[PDB]
Design a protein around this ligand. Structure first.
Ligand SMILES: [Fe+2]
Ligand SMILES: [Fe+2]
Lengths: 292, 290
């Protein structure tokens, strides 16, 4: 197994010759260290059944089942399915078309996200990424001092997806279910990365709905929108310097840093088939050390 | 044709009405009864969808419901409430509301023609919001003068089959653009009877506003909901009437004075109702802004 860096960038790395059935424990830790510093590792030539995909994921941590069963793979609930291939729909079509970190709206977010594309359109398909640790460092000192001591408030209520059994329900009832089952969760606005020690600005346009001070009082300023602006999350041209665009190819298996990165899906505006399998695992740490 | 009260100042039954042979004086006698007794029950009606629409046109200009999901397949003027898998929409109106209260130009008359009446009767609750105002304590009447009601469909908008897999915030945005909130005076003079109507409903009224347009941050709206009997989940409040229809009934009621809601019990049996909504020579009140 050989880990190779990406051409002309310190973001991302490739992993060639990886076979999870033969990979040593030293191999796994070498890939882990690549993930936490290069932010994303792309395993090449992966041809795995769902069961073998889950076993590869289990070598990197403890899987977390997505809270909403509509997304589940029918045979392995640990697999999250993004698919637009029906007469009945399996999984959910074109998930994640918004800036977010995974489970940012949940009380205990996991450290590693695995994405295993199954069907890839040739054009206009990919994933955008922003390193929110590097995005914090590139903030002006004004914003650096403003975010200190604050807390982010994160909720799924913006991009919660209507389910088949929601038809004919009054929309207020759904909003109440969202607040009861998935209430807004608080996290420190910045935290120390438990593995690299860098400072991460933990916000995303999709899930972060507001800010609060240490005592839980909401922040009245437009600081949150200015943080979205400065980190590049409001540039709908996706040319901002913080933004990386990656195009997976057949055989790729992505494992990236769910603490440092926010991401957003690039899909076609067509019914062309596109399928991706997701597995999400807790590593050896929570979001940050000493998390209450 | 004969009009009789039902021995209760709420409600009247109309016997011997045939819309194919009724005269203009019959129609006007029924209209006068609707604005006074608040609901007129036409007995022994036997109508196809087309004949039902012809009947409704004798009472005014029909309004087509804005959301096409509720439309009857061959007559768009007919609003279909059905739990039979699918034309119409199931489990409709399980909340106090006046029809089109969330719209800028509410109509005065609502017609309901049940198609499938189970033996487990599926009736309708009613509250006369004119009498609800008169029974308010004087200080509550004082709090109400000069205010405005803000009405929106955003709470009981029903998810449609083409909404599946959409993010919920996009539907809320679509609701705001197509059917934004609408202001009406908190009370108004009934343009047919002259009485004062407290024009609120738990289902559609989302807030109150100052005479200047400033939101009323008090809990007056909730206290108005409670005082008019809209928060009584036992349906025992003295303002509440439970009407039970029988086979040939056709209901026409005052959509200005009355609020209504469906039964609390979940229906197991098939039940279908055809609704026609109609403008009646007057707007919500005389002197509405254009
Ligand atoms: Fe995602
Ligand atoms: Fe209704």
């Amino acid at each position: 197994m050989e880990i190779k860096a990406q051409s002309g960038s310190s973001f991302g790395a490739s992993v060639e010759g990886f076979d999870h059935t033969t990979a040593t424990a030293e191999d796994i830790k070498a890939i882990k260290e690549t993930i936490y510093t290069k932010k994303i590792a792309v395993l090449k030539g992966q041809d795995l059944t769902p069961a073998q995909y889950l076993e590869l994921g289990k070598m990197f941590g403890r899987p977390v089942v997505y809270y909403e069963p509509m997304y589940k793979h029918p045979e392995f609930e640990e697999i999250f399915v993004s698919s637009n291939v029906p007469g009945k729909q399996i999984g959910v079509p074109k998930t994640g078309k918004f800036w977010h970190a995974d489970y940012q709206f949940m009380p205990d977010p996991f450290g590693l996200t695995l994405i295993y594309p199954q069907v890839i359109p040739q054009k206009n398909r990919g994933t955008y990424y922003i390193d929110m640790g590097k995005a914090y460092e590139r903030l002006p000192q004004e914003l650096k001092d403003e975010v200190a001591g604050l807390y982010g408030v994160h909720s799924v209520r913006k991009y919660f997806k209507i389910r088949p059994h929601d038809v004919y329900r009054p929309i207020s009832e759904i909003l109440t279910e969202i607040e009861e089952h998935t209430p807004p969760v608080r996290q420190p606005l910045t935290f120390k990365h438990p593995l690299t020690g860098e400072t991460v600005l933990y916000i995303s346009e999709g899930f972060t709905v507001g800010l609060e001070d240490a005592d839980g009082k909401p922040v009245e300023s437009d600081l949150l929108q200015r943080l979205f602006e400065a980190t590049g999350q409001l540039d709908d041209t996706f040319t901002h310097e913080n933004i990386h665009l990656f195009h997976p190819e057949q055989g790729d298996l992505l494992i990236w840093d769910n603490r440092s990165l926010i991401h957003r899906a690039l899909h076609t505006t067509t019914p062309e088939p596109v399928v991706s399998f997701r597995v999400t695992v807790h590593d050896e740490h929570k979001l940050y050390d000493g998390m209450p």
